[PDB]
Design a protein around this ligand. Sequence first.
Ligand SMILES: [Zn+2]
Ligand SMILES: [Zn+2]
Ligand SMILES: [Zn+2]
Ligand SMILES: [Zn+2]
Ligand SMILES: [Zn+2]
Length: 192
Amino acid sequence: QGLAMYLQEGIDCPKCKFSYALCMHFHCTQCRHQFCSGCYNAFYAKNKCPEPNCRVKKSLHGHHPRDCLFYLRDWTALRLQKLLQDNNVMFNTEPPGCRVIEQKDEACGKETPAGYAGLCQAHYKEYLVSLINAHSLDPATLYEVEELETATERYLHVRPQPLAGEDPPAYQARLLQKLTEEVPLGQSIPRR
Ligand SMILES: [Zn+2]
Ligand SMILES: [Zn+2]
Ligand SMILES: [Zn+2]
Ligand SMILES: [Zn+2]
Ligand SMILES: [Zn+2]
């Protein structure tokens, strides 16, 4: 199932633990902490980010693991579905407007395109990402070489390069391997 569990889900501040329900970033009204609603990492005002290697220090931002909704929400549903199929995780495309209840407690009510189960496009995508996260699926397994290059620069701070007489497939396998060994999926994302 998992569509039911998305729908029954609730957001807790990672600092104060106040429970909210209520944009990737969230402002805690109890403690004034700000954080990612997808991965719970901190969002830093200009220019409060403590990471010394941050090239984006003058903008409001957070650092997200590669399986945060902040990134996966840019994938097409199709591609997300492919991740899910490759790991034998079932998902809906038909319903068993939009059904998701929001605290304004009213339904989203937006138009529901074909194939997005009974949801709007944005909510369907949160469903898929929920799931991916629930089962700890690694997106990097569908990365093309260039996304793998971007990933190893973003998470390991190295610009990689093909070795001599390394074909694109081997290059890809090496980048994926190093990436999976050295950089975990989201460390605060709730898992099954
Ligand atoms: Zn804000
Ligand atoms: Zn708080
Ligand atoms: Zn995030
Ligand atoms: Zn930063
Ligand atoms: Zn919706």
